[PDB]
Amino acid sequence: EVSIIQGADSTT
């Protein structure tokens, strides 16, 4: 399948 490669974020 397709994987979109992205920066992650955190809730802290």
Partner 1 sequence: KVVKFSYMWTINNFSFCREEMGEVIKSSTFSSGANDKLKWCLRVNPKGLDEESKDYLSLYLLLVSCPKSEVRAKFKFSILNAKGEETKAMESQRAYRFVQGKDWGFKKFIRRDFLLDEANGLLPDDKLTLFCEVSVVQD
Q: Which of residues 1-12 bind partner 1 (CB under 8 A)?
A: 1-12
Give me the least distance between CB of 11 and partner 1, in Å please.
Answer: 6
Q: How far is the CB of 9 from partner 1 (least distance, A)?
A: 5
Distance CA 9, CA 5 (A): 13
Query: CA-CA distance, 12 to 2, in Å (whole number)?
Result: 29
* Residues 9, 6: Cα–Cα separation, whole Å: 10
Minimum CB separation of residue 2 from partner 1 in Å reads: 5
- Please give the residue ranges that form the binding site for partner 1 (CB under 8 A): 1-12
